[PDB]
Amino acid sequence: KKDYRKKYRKYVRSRFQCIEDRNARLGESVSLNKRYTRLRLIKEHRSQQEREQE
Amino acid sequence: MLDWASGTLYQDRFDYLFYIHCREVSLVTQRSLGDLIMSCCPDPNPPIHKIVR
Amino acid sequence: LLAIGKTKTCESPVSPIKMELLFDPDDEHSEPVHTVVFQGAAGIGKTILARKMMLDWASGTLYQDRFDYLFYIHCREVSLVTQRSLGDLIMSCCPDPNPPIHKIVRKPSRILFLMDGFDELQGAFDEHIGPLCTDWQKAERGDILLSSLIRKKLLPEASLLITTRPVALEKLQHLLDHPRHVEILGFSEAKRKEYFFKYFSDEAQARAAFSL
Amino acid sequence: MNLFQKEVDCEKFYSFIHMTFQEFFAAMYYLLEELKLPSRD
Numbered sequence A: 001k002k003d004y005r006k007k008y009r010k011y012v013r014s015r016f017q018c019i020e021d022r023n024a025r026l027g028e029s030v031s032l033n034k035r036y037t038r039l040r041l042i043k044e045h046r047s048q049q050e051r052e053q054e
Numbered sequence B: 001m002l003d004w005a006s007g008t009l010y011q012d013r014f015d016y017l018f019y020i021h022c023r024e025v026s027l028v029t030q031r032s033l034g035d036l037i038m039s040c041c042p043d044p045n046p047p048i049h050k051i052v053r
Numbered sequence C: 001l002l003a004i005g006k007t008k009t010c011e012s013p014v015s016p017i018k019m020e021l022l023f024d025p026d027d028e029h030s031e032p033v034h035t036v037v038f039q040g041a042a043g044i045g046k047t048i049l050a051r052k053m054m055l056d057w058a059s060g061t062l063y064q065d066r067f068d069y070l071f072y073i074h075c076r077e078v079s080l081v082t083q084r085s086l087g088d089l090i091m092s093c094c095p096d097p098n099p100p101i102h103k104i105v106r107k108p109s110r111i112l113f114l115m116d117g118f119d120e121l122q123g124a125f126d127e128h129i130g131p132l133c134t135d136w137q138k139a140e141r142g143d144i145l146l147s148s149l150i151r152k153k154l155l156p157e158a159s160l161l162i163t164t165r166p167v168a169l170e171k172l173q174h175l176l177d178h179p180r181h182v183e184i185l186g187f188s189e190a191k192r193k194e195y196f197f198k199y200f201s202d203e204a205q206a207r208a209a210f211s212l
Numbered sequence D: 001m002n003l004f005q006k007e008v009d010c011e012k013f014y015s016f017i018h019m020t021f022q023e024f025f026a027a028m029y030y031l032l033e034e035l036k037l038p039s040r041d
C-alpha cells in the first residue's frame, strides 16, 4: 500500500498554488484561487466578416 | 492542474495530469517519456511501469 | 535611511513574525512553503540565527515535528569544483563512519537544509548548468549539486532555508520555488539595552556601559 | 541591492547600508590617497 496518486496530488497541489507576476520581488507570490477569474471559452465558429466586425 | 490536485474536476477519467511546458523542454538531446514523467514527478524513481500501464 | 540616521527613536511598533511557524502555509488549508530566504545587511545576524535554530531544534524547542534532520551547510566552506555528492554533504554534518542515508533521505518530507552566505557564490552562478542531478548517490560535481538542491531537484519535497546578503536577489529569483523570504533588521530599541545586560556581568557595569 | 518595482518591472537601485556609513566612506575617500569625482580639495 502506497497511494502514489495521493503523494503526486499533494506535490502538484503544493507546487501549483501560487502565481508570480512579472514584477514580483522575492517572495511576493499570489494565490491562484485569489487572483484567478474565469475566462470565456468558445468552440470556434469565427467567420471572416465576423472577425473583422469583432 | 491545481483543481485536479485538490479534487475539484476530473476526479475520475484520469489521475496523472503531467504538465509539460514546451519552452523548457529543449529538443536535441535524449528526451525519453520516462524522464518526461520523472521530471514532473518528485521521487528518486516514480512507478512508470505502473503509471503508464 | 535618513530617519534611522537621525534617531529613529519615535514609537513605531510593528507586528512581529514568529519562528516555529515560518514554514506554515499562508492561509490554513493551502500548501506549506518549501523555501525561506533570510536576507539582511552584512553581519546582522544571519549565521547566528541559523545556529540558534539548529541548537533550539537539537534541544527540542522548535520544529519538534515537521523535520528532524536540519543539515547546516555553510556556503563558504563548500568549495564547488571537485565532486560534492549529497551523500558526502550529509555525511560531513553527521558524525559517523557511515550515517544511514538510504534511510535519512528516504523521507525528504522531513528535512531542513539550512544554508548560509549565499552571497559567497553570486559569481558562481552565471551559466545555467545543463546537468541538474536528481540523485544523492552520484558524483554531483559540486556547484551543479548546489544548483540542483536550490532548484529542488534533489529531494524536491525536502524543505529549505537560505540566508544571504542582499547582493543577488535578481539572479537568485530565477532559481527559487516561490520562496517566502524574511528580512532581518537587528535589535530594535530595547533589545539593545537588553543585549548589554547579557554581554556585561552585572548591573553596575551594564548601567554605565549602556548610558555611555 | 534593494530592488524597486515600478509599473511592470523592477530596477536595481543600489544603496548604502546607511547614510552615516556613506558619509564615513566619503570621509575615507578624502583622507585616503589616490568622469571625475568632486575635487579632493
Ligand SMILES: Nc1ncnc2c1ncn2[C@@H]1O[C@H](COP(=O)(O)OP(=O)(O)OP(O)(O)=S)[C@@H](O)[C@H]1O
Pocket: C041, C042, C043, C044, C045, C046, C047, C048, C049, C117, C165, C195
Ligand atoms: N542573535 C544575536 N544576538 C546577539 N549578538 C549577535 C546575534 N547574532 C549575531 N550577533 C553578533 O554578530 C556577530 C556576527 O553575526 P552574523 O549574523 O553571524 O554575521 P554574518 O551575517 O554571518 O556575517 P556575514 O554577513 O554572514 S559575512 C556575532 O559575532 C555576534 O557577536
Ligand SMILES: [Mg+2]
Pocket: C045, C046, C047, C048, C116, C117, C163
Ligand atoms: Mg550569515
